[PDB]
């Protein structure tokens, strides 16, 4: 089973303001469970998942104290990067972080993640080996040189292999009835006529969880770039939507639906009634 | 649980 814990951090500088906005978003199996925001009346790690209510005040206070330190780490790092790129003191700047791990089979650790970003583009990232760094530019090479002498990678590896794995095991046990929940998609084909004697057959897929789905059109065998596709969109009730369409002459064509919620892949055609 | 970063950039 593919299981993963992620922490999506953001630090946005404000014009003239001494303190920037720090947001830390936690994810378990691509779905949100925890969130911290500096803009709030009382900045604390708030539960976003219903199964997360099981934790006592000891867990919430410890995570909030971790976030307060991170809030200042991002504040200094953001100011140090202004010195590297030799940019103006007043402006809008963004520092992003992606950290966590993938379990694999079965509850053992498969891949470690630790990436950083500046102005939307890549900056510095910890490699697959979890010992070396990849610098996107010369400013990131200074950060790399700083982290190589201090041995930062050694302690980041200790989290991803230790604490990150240990805590994800607990979240899978506490939240199991709603986390391992699978929703099968609702599939149907629509008819849309066009000029020049052509028609667009749109293969729909509505109400499915998780977001991972595969929609392909077939002319008996395999239709690649000629097929129109849209990004997987959320409905709003914790479920997803997606469709795939193809331009065909004025016709019986096959659509293939691949989802983990359904036992056998769905094969469907158009009517008419 | 979240992670606390080491040395700054």
């Amino acid at each position, epitope marked *: 089973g593919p299981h993963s814990m992620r922490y999506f951090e953001t630090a946005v500088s404000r014009p003239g303001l001494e303190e920037p906005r720090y947001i830390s978003v936690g994810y378990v199996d691509n779905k949100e469970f925890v969130r911290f925001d500096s803009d709030a009346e009382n900045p604390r790690y708030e539960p976003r998942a219903p199964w997360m209510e099981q934790e006592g005040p000891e867990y919430w206070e410890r995570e909030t104290q971790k976030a307060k330190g991170q809030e200042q780490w991002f504040r200094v790092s953001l*100011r140090n990067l*202004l010195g590297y790129y030799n940019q103006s003191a007043g402006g809008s700047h963004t520092l992003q972080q992606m950290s966590g791990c993938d379990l694999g089979s079965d509850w053992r650790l498969l891949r470690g993640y630790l990436q950083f970003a500046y102005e939307g583009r890549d900056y510095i990232a910890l490699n697959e080996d979890l010992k070396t760094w990849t610098a996107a530019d010369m400013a990131a090479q200074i950060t790399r040189r700083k982290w190589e002498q201090s041995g930062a990678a050694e302690h980041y590896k200790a989290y991803l292999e230790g604490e990150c794995v240990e805590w994800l095991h607990r979240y899978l046990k506490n939240g199991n009835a709603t986390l391992l929940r699978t929703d099968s998609p609702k599939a149907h084909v629509t008819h849309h006529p066009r000029s020049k004697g052509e028609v667009t057959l749109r293969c729909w897929a509505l109400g499915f969880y998780p977001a991972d789905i595969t929609l392909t059109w077939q002319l008996n065998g395999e239709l690649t770039q000629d097929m129109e596709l849209v990004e997987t969109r959320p409905a709003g009730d914790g479920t997803f939507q997606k469709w795939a369409s193809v331009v065909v002459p004025l016709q019986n064509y096959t659509c293939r639906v691949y989802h983990e919620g359904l036992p056998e892949p769905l094969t469907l055609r158009w009517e008419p009634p | 649980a979240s992670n606390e970063n080491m040395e700054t950039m």
Partner: T-cell receptor
Amino acid sequence: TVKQNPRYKLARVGKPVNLICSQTMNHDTMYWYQKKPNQAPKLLLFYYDKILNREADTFEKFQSSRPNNSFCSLYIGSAGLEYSAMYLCASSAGLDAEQYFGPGTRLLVLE
Amino acid sequence: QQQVRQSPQSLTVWEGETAILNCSYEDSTFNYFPWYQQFPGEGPALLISIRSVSDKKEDGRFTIFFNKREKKLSLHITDSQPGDSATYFCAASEGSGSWQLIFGSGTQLTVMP
């Protein structure tokens, strides 16, 4: 208020040096400054609780250790003639608050 | 530059007189301006500080006259005592980073009794 012992430190070239600084004020931030004779005290590095920050032009020359929030240390390895200066240690309750300086440790490196 | 530059290098004045210690800064974004005093064999202690909002800060004898339109500071010591004989430093810190105080070379004051 901000302790710094010894007041004078002596070391040979190539040998490592570790200058210790302590505070009883329970401050989150502790700084390290370099004071050259008849020159402005320049900031080397600082420690906010657990987080360490080093200046882009300072790093590779200076290292830092923190056993607990009440203490702070500046590490030099290896020592050279260019390291011979007065080393001041500052302490602040917050990252954006007033700084309280120690007496300073005068370092002299000889061949 | 930043820089921070201070004038003069060393000032000598008789007891009871008024001593003027000048300072100049380059960065206009500087808001906080603290003044430190250190005695021989003793570290710098916070004497008196001034912000960009105000242009005058009084504390008995020690006074700072801040000028934003000329980017300069001045420390006035009325009725100079021999106990004031110390090195006077001036620092400056901007908004985004208050931790980084850009200090001056200093002025070595000598009060003749």
